[PDB]
Design a binder for these strands. Structure first.
Ligand SMILES: *C(=O)[C@H](CCSC)NC=O
Ligand SMILES: [Mg+2]
Ligand SMILES: [Mg+2]
Ligand SMILES: [Mg+2]
Ligand SMILES: [Mg+2]
Ligand SMILES: [Mg+2]
Ligand SMILES: [Mg+2]
Ligand SMILES: [Mg+2]
Ligand SMILES: [Mg+2]
Ligand SMILES: [Mg+2]
Ligand SMILES: [Mg+2]
Ligand SMILES: [Mg+2]
Ligand SMILES: [Mg+2]
Ligand SMILES: [Mg+2]
Ligand SMILES: [Mg+2]
Ligand SMILES: [Mg+2]
Ligand SMILES: [Mg+2]
Ligand SMILES: [Mg+2]
Ligand SMILES: [Mg+2]
Ligand SMILES: [Mg+2]
Ligand SMILES: [Mg+2]
Ligand SMILES: [Mg+2]
Ligand SMILES: [Mg+2]
Ligand SMILES: [Mg+2]
Ligand SMILES: [Mg+2]
Ligand SMILES: [Mg+2]
Ligand SMILES: [Mg+2]
Ligand SMILES: [Mg+2]
Ligand SMILES: [Mg+2]
Ligand SMILES: [Mg+2]
Ligand SMILES: [Mg+2]
Ligand SMILES: [Mg+2]
Ligand SMILES: [Mg+2]
Ligand SMILES: [Mg+2]
Ligand SMILES: [Mg+2]
Ligand SMILES: [Mg+2]
Ligand SMILES: [Mg+2]
Ligand SMILES: [Mg+2]
Ligand SMILES: [Mg+2]
Ligand SMILES: [Mg+2]
Ligand SMILES: [Mg+2]
Ligand SMILES: [Mg+2]
Ligand SMILES: [Mg+2]
Ligand SMILES: [Mg+2]
Ligand SMILES: [Mg+2]
Ligand SMILES: [Mg+2]
Ligand SMILES: [Mg+2]
Ligand SMILES: [Mg+2]
Ligand SMILES: [Mg+2]
Ligand SMILES: [Mg+2]
Ligand SMILES: [Mg+2]
Ligand SMILES: [Mg+2]
Ligand SMILES: [Mg+2]
Ligand SMILES: [Mg+2]
Ligand SMILES: [Mg+2]
Ligand SMILES: [Mg+2]
Ligand SMILES: [Mg+2]
Ligand SMILES: [Mg+2]
Ligand SMILES: [Mg+2]
Ligand SMILES: [Mg+2]
Ligand SMILES: [Mg+2]
Ligand SMILES: [Mg+2]
Ligand SMILES: [Mg+2]
Ligand SMILES: [Mg+2]
Ligand SMILES: [Mg+2]
Ligand SMILES: [Mg+2]
Ligand SMILES: [Mg+2]
Ligand SMILES: [Mg+2]
Ligand SMILES: [Mg+2]
Ligand SMILES: [Mg+2]
Ligand SMILES: [Mg+2]
Ligand SMILES: [Mg+2]
Ligand SMILES: [Mg+2]
Ligand SMILES: [Mg+2]
Ligand SMILES: [Mg+2]
Ligand SMILES: [Mg+2]
Ligand SMILES: [Mg+2]
Ligand SMILES: [Mg+2]
Ligand SMILES: [Mg+2]
Ligand SMILES: [Mg+2]
Ligand SMILES: [Mg+2]
Ligand SMILES: [Mg+2]
Ligand SMILES: [Mg+2]
Ligand SMILES: [Mg+2]
Ligand SMILES: [Mg+2]
Ligand SMILES: [Mg+2]
Ligand SMILES: [Mg+2]
Ligand SMILES: [Mg+2]
Ligand SMILES: [Mg+2]
Ligand SMILES: [Mg+2]
Ligand SMILES: [Mg+2]
Ligand SMILES: [Mg+2]
Ligand SMILES: [Mg+2]
Ligand SMILES: [Mg+2]
Ligand SMILES: [Mg+2]
Lengths: 76, 51, 96, 63
RNA sequence: AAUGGGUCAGCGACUUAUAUUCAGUGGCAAGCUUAACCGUAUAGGGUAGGCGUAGCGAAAGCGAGUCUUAAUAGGGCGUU
RNA sequence: AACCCACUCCCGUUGAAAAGGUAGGGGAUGACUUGUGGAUCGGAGUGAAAGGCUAAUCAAGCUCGGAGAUAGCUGGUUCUC
RNA sequence: UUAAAAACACAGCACUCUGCAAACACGAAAGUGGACGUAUAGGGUGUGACGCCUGCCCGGUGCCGGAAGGUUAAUUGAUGG
RNA sequence: UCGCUGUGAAGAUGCAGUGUAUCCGCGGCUAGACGGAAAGACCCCGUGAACCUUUACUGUAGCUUUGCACUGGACUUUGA
RNA sequence: CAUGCUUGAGGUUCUAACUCUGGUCCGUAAUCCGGAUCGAGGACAGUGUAUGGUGGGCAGUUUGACUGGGGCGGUCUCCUCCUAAAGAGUAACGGAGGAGUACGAAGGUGCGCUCAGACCGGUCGGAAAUCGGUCGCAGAGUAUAAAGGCAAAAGCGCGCUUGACUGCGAGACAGACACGUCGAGCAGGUACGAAAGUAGGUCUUAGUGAUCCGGUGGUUCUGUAUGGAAGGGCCAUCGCU
């Protein structure tokens, strides 16, 4: 056997789901690459982390050309 | 391998930065502009010995 | 402090600071304790006539706490700015 | 007889009215490869964790 | 079909000292309490000392504030 | 042959015996056997050498102290709701 | 006190050390054995009557000899800070 | 204080089903009572123990080099 | 450079220290021991102390764990995919691959542009170089494995440059602890751009090692009678297959 290796799990994924109340600075999605793109009121980190710049409600809409998926914040 | 150096400000203050470089490929001394907290201006820094 | 062989906290973190031997001759006194000396003179030896300070104390400072009871005069004892007004307001002369 | 406090515990944890202070690790050497933000945030002093107070106090003979 | 005990009677294993933390129950109370020692000897005296009434800082120091900092900006710890 | 020894078989193995007995066996003027007295010893003695012997105890005697060594290991831990 | 043997000893052989207050051993030391001996003697090591013999390798590790050169301790203390 | 076939800490005098069998000795034989004896010696484990080895680590007796002391006079070569 | 003054080093010699397990006298009736005297050696030997070498002769100890029993073999920290059951997490001596770096530009910014490949024509190259045209839309590329991304291209070129800045930091994610990850905004100074603006390294996830100890640069701290210093503290940094 010449196989026994693996790496620690990074705990990626959606942290806040749709309809939830966000506060500014909260982390929304942890990603490799941009599987979700930043919408209104959402910024992108230097490792493709989606966080919140304003307060409100998570939206999770897909729109526009290229058929992307957008995470935005709307008024509660 | 990259070897550590020090960048010391042109101002008389003893403040310095630290980094590394490729001594084999780039032999000329690094002459960079950086911010000096002690005098609170952007001045010229020059390479020295990390040791 | 044992943890099963893992490096314990008292050896995992750095030591820091030094112990000031200058502060071992120091004492602090509230303004609410000033109305307990015998009569109208708050001095180093008079604070030792009660049990306000130990016999090994040489420097005393007064901070602001509580209220001053009467009009006392301080003989070579320091005070803060809040206690300077409190002592002075109740006729308490300050000198030396 | 009298309890003897651990010598090395008293040099690393200082008692205050807000608990026990201590410094941070990973700040002794190998500091060029670290980020300035990472080194700036390891600079102050902080309070002991709720899970370490019991085992540290017992080393300092405080409980 | 793993251990131990043939049976009876007697003996046979969480104690003590000194330091300390938490709880219950009391005495005093911004104060409480004495140790050696003296003693008309479980009384009375002896308050040297210990804890509390103020914190922040590695420290000098300043103090209801203090530390970091160029910063009465932020932030940590503290205060009715 | 006496004396010293211990090669084989059987018996005995709770033995007559904590190493024997009956039958056979080896040396038997020598590097022999033996009495009495004396010398060497515990990391030490002595050894024609088997790690053998040093009071039925030996890859370090016995005895009294350090000492109730230490035991993350077995065993045990006593009346009632 | 489960092994008596092909094991140990042996006469014979070789190497090596030792010039005497000998090498060597037991003793903090004094001293004692070697030995009231003196290289045809004494200690250590291996082989093991007798017969015929005992071949090649000095690179490794030991021992013996050499002292030019290189490194090298306590000690001393120029010079600088 | 029975046999068998099953079940079951997995090889049953004692459990299930079933078959056999009046109560108790004495002389014999050893198939079972995982029969008695010795807290398995083999194997593994313990941050266990002894004793042995070596170019394991760290020391050390002994042996050996030089400086200083006990320790002096003269001549000669040679250096500063 | 004869010459005088001291010292370093070697050689020879002398006697007077020291040595004699050499002779003869005495204590004494004595192979010990002393003292006296002859003889030999002689500042050597030997002993004390400081120091280098050798030294299993002797001693106190160490010599890992996992493991379909132990040994032998293999592994031990980090990253990517599957196992993993459509939130996170999830084991085996399960199935497959990488890391222990690189870059002063391969970073920042303003401006500009799109690939691989196929076919047709064209001087030697000829299946495949450089050239022109048509088709194509990502089958290319990304410093480096794999996964997830990439048109405001995160891919390629050029000008200017040092934000690969200093003090912080609302709020979160992860989490036994120690560590780890993201970050709008504020204050100082900057770089590109006409400006809105963007910049607290690189498309993201590996490229790493606590404390102690010791060194180097600063310092409004301390500094055992006092004034200094030594030493200590604080801040920045260096030394661990
Ligand atoms: C092995 O066969 C074992 C020990 C034998 S002695 C090495 N058997 C025991 O009966
Ligand atoms: Mg595997
Ligand atoms: Mg693998
Ligand atoms: Mg896993
Ligand atoms: Mg960003
Ligand atoms: Mg460990
Ligand atoms: Mg008092
Ligand atoms: Mg202490
Ligand atoms: Mg570090
Ligand atoms: Mg530091
Ligand atoms: Mg039974
Ligand atoms: Mg059993
Ligand atoms: Mg049983
Ligand atoms: Mg048992
Ligand atoms: Mg058992
Ligand atoms: Mg029994
Ligand atoms: Mg109480
Ligand atoms: Mg009460
Ligand atoms: Mg504040
Ligand atoms: Mg006889
Ligand atoms: Mg015999
Ligand atoms: Mg026999
Ligand atoms: Mg026999
Ligand atoms: Mg017969
Ligand atoms: Mg006979
Ligand atoms: Mg016979
Ligand atoms: Mg015969
Ligand atoms: Mg005798
Ligand atoms: Mg004796
Ligand atoms: Mg012994
Ligand atoms: Mg043997
Ligand atoms: Mg022996
Ligand atoms: Mg015996
Ligand atoms: Mg022993
Ligand atoms: Mg004994
Ligand atoms: Mg015992
Ligand atoms: Mg003891
Ligand atoms: Mg029990
Ligand atoms: Mg009962
Ligand atoms: Mg025989
Ligand atoms: Mg033999
Ligand atoms: Mg000989
Ligand atoms: Mg032989
Ligand atoms: Mg032979
Ligand atoms: Mg040779
Ligand atoms: Mg040679
Ligand atoms: Mg030689
Ligand atoms: Mg069955
Ligand atoms: Mg049964
Ligand atoms: Mg059965
Ligand atoms: Mg049956
Ligand atoms: Mg039954
Ligand atoms: Mg039954
Ligand atoms: Mg039945
Ligand atoms: Mg029978
Ligand atoms: Mg039977
Ligand atoms: Mg049996
Ligand atoms: Mg036992
Ligand atoms: Mg057992
Ligand atoms: Mg263990
Ligand atoms: Mg040993
Ligand atoms: Mg020596
Ligand atoms: Mg000498
Ligand atoms: Mg002699
Ligand atoms: Mg004599
Ligand atoms: Mg004489
Ligand atoms: Mg003479
Ligand atoms: Mg001499
Ligand atoms: Mg000498
Ligand atoms: Mg000597
Ligand atoms: Mg030894
Ligand atoms: Mg040894
Ligand atoms: Mg050794
Ligand atoms: Mg020891
Ligand atoms: Mg020991
Ligand atoms: Mg050992
Ligand atoms: Mg070890
Ligand atoms: Mg193991
Ligand atoms: Mg198994
Ligand atoms: Mg198996
Ligand atoms: Mg196995
Ligand atoms: Mg192995
Ligand atoms: Mg699921
Ligand atoms: Mg999942
Ligand atoms: Mg599990
Ligand atoms: Mg690998
Ligand atoms: Mg790039
Ligand atoms: Mg073309
Ligand atoms: Mg575009
Ligand atoms: Mg969480
Ligand atoms: Mg401009
Ligand atoms: Mg250490
Ligand atoms: Mg002084
Ligand atoms: Mg002083
Ligand atoms: Mg200093």
């Amino acid at each position: 056997t010449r196989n026994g290796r693996d790496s620690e799990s990074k705990r990626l994924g959606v942290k806040l789901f749709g309809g939830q109340a966000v506060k500014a600075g909260n982390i929304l999605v942890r990603q490799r690459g941009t599987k979700f793109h930043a919408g209104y009121g959402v910024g992108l980190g230097k490792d493709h982390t989606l966080f919140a710049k304003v307060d409100g409600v998570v939206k999770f809409e897909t729109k526009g050309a290229f058929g992307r998926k957008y995470v935005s914040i709307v008024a509660a | 391998m990259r070897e550590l150096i020090r960048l010391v400000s042109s101002a008389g203050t003893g403040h310095f930065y630290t980094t590394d470089k490729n001594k084999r490929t780039k032999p000329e001394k690094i002459e960079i502009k950086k911010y000096d907290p002690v005098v609170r201006q952007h001045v010229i820094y020059k390479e020295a010995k990390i040791k | 402090g044992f943890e099963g062989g893992q490096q314990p906290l008292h050896r995992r973190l750095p030591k820091f600071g030094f112990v000031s031997l200058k502060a071992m001759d120091r004492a602090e006194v509230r303004t609410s304790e000033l109305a307990k000396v015998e009569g109208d003179v708050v001095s180093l030896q008079t604070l030792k006539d009660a049990n306000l300070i130990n016999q090994h104390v040489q420097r005393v400072k007064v901070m602001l706490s509580g209220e001053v009871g009467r009009a006392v005069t301080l003989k070579g004892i320091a005070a803060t700015k809040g206690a300077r007004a409190a002592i002075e307001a109740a006729g308490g002369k300050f000198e030396d | 007889p009298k309890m003897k406090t651990k010598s090395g515990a008293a040099k690393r944890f200082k008692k205050t009215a807000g608990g026990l202070k201590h410094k941070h690790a990973f700040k002794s050497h190998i500091l060029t490869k670290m980020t300035t933000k990472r080194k700036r945030q390891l600079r102050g002093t902080s309070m002991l964790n709720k899970s370490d107070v019991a085992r540290v106090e017992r080393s300092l003979r405080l409980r």
